[PDB]
Design a protein around this ligand. Structure first.
Ligand SMILES: [Zn+2]
Lengths: 171, 39, 187, 48
């Protein structure tokens, strides 16, 4: 428990501490007191101070203290829309719905507000991936036409037939 | 292999529909050469 | 790559395929060639999830794939799959896919033309107007079913013809934007 | 298989279904297939 337990409690306490609304930056010593790890080794103190508290993607050094990066975390409809837009523009791809719901409590309000602007991809594990709905080129069809399209086989043809059908009918 | 066919040059599964397409294109002369009475 | 090709590809993909296919195609549109591993990490799709989508794109041959083999820095063999969009086959396959609908649509019209009119209400068997006279019984003076020895109906054959014809007609009306894009991309 | 095609089931599912259909058709013609199980009548008796 001495090695990982102390650092884990730092992360768990700091993560939960933010949920209390205390967005003000915190020091390692303050967290060590709140976690009762004042007896942590001198080398462990500096190690956490120099590595664990700076390399985590959710901790930022501000005036020598550590903060939860409120700008990075998604907690509003505008951030959700802009992030999906910018991610789509740069071809970065989608973002898991759980990443937003864990970041923004009751994300459904923001999700339902954007509505069709959010494209939901359901993964084999039922998880949803969110994508930006770029409305540049749009087209949609009836289920009957989508069924007709699926009914027309395309793969069971050779290049000869693929081109022959064109000239066979006149195009 | 088993009950299905492969084509290798580099390997693909060869489906009965694709074989059906290929065979449907075979001419009468090729059937005679193959010793198959087309009728 | 003319924008008309990109617009056509996006219209047909978003029109008759799911967003997964469109997003994957947009990647191949944004970049001429992208590795399968890159598309996988970007889309965050599972291997079978993306592979099946890519297999579909392989089925319609809208995209092409080439395999590159090289030795990694640690000495392990590496085989990367590079995917790219083949607008030539895409335009050719959609032209077939669309002119096949016309054949299938007119086949459905010919079916609506050939769908037998008479039918037996007991066994739910449909009889052709040529066969109905063969099945006619002079003693009763009306059509009957040999298996059921019961009256044969004729009026219900209009309902399926009317209903299907609406779908066939509405299909031709909605498909015109893609046909216009094709006329713009024939070159 | 018809419903799987009408429903647009997964390719691997349809492939396995066709592979199963292929096995049933083959076994019905010949039960003496190599490398394949003998089709029993649920009582230890091989089907003719
Ligand atoms: Zn009857």
């Amino acid at each position: 428990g001495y090695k990982f337990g102390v650092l884990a409690k730092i992360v768990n306490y700091m993560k939960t501490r933010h949920q209390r609304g205390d967005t003000h930056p915190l020091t390692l010593d303050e967290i060590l007191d709140e976690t009762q790890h004042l007896d942590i080794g001198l080398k462990q103190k500096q190690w956490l101070m120099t590595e664990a508290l700076v390399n985590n993607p959710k901790i930022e050094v501000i005036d020598g203290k550590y903060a939860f990066k409120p700008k990075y975390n998604v907690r509003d409809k505008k951030a959700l829309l802009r992030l999906l837009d910018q991610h789509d523009q740069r071809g970065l791809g989608g973002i898991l719905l759980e990443d937003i719901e864990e970041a923004l409590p009751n994300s459904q309000k923001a999700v339902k507000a954007l509505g069709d602007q959010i494209l939901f991809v359901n993964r084999p594990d039922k998880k949803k991936i969110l994508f930006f709905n770029d409305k540049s080129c749009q087209f949609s069809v009836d289920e009957e036409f989508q069924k007709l399209w699926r009914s027309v086989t395309v793969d069971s043809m050779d290049e000869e037939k693929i081109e022959e059908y064109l000239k066979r009918q006149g195009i | 292999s088993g009950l299905e066919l492969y084509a290798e040059w580099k390997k693909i599964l060869l489906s009965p529909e694709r074989v059906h397409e290929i065979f449907k294109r075979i001419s009468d002369e090729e059937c005679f050469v193959l010793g198959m009475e087309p009728r | 790559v003319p924008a008309a090709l990109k617009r056509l590809a996006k219209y047909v993909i978003r029109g008759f395929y799911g967003i997964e296919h469109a997003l994957a195609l947009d990647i191949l549109i944004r970049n001429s060639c992208v590795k399968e591993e890159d598309m996988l990490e970007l889309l965050k799709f599972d291997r079978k999830q993306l592979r099946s989508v890519l297999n579909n794109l392989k089925g319609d041959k809208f995209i092409k794939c080439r395999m590159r083999v090289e030795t990694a820095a640690d000495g392990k063999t590496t085989r990367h799959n590079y995917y790219f969009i083949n607008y030539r086959t895409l335009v050719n396959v959609v032209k077939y896919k669309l002119d096949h609908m016309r054949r299938r649509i007119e086949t459905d019209e010919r079916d609506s033309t050939n769908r037998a009119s008479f039918k037996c209400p007991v066994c739910s068997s449909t009889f052709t107007d040529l066969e109905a006279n063969q099945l006619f019984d002079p003693m009763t003076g009306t059509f009957r079913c040999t298996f059921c020895h019961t009256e044969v109906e004729e009026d219900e054959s209009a309902m399926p013809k009317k209903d299907a014809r609406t779908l066939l007609a509405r299909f031709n009306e909605q498909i015109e934007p893609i046909y216009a894009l094709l006329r713009e991309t024939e070159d | 298989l018809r419903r799987n095609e009408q429903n647009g089931a997964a390719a691997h599912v349809i492939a396995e279904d066709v592979k199963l259909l292929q096995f049933h058709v083959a076994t019905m013609v010949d039960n003496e297939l190599p490398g394949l199980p003998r089709a029993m009548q649920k009582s230890g008796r091989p089907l003719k």
